[PDB]
Amino acid sequence: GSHMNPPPPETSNPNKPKRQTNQLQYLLRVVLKTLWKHQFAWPFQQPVDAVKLNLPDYYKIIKTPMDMGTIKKRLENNYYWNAQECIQDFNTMFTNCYIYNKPGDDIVLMAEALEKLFLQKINELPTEE
Ligand SMILES: COc1cc(Br)ccn1
16 A cells, blocks of 8 residues: 555465464454444554545554454464464554554544453453363
């Protein structure tokens, strides 16, 4: 897309060691599945196109972008070694939302609803077997 948006996060790299764990399978099959289909998922399902949204400062402020489309592709591509890397991606996505926007903005309310659901799902994350 536009040269004024940054390249999206890596989802493929043969040099990075990879594993499928039961925890990672739960993150794809339960956690991402639940969040992806939520009514409030859509602002999070792809990278922020700061040109289309007329937010030229967005990637001045947000230096660690992350979105659920990227996490979905990471999971589908078995990009991770462990669940914590994936949980960290989710946490980064929510934190970016809360940094860029204001308390009570619609996108913040949406992120808070998703994050509550995410926390419930992570509380049920199985032990790594
Ligand atoms: C209006 O601000 C934002 C913030 C994010 Br994160 C995504 C889209 N718009």
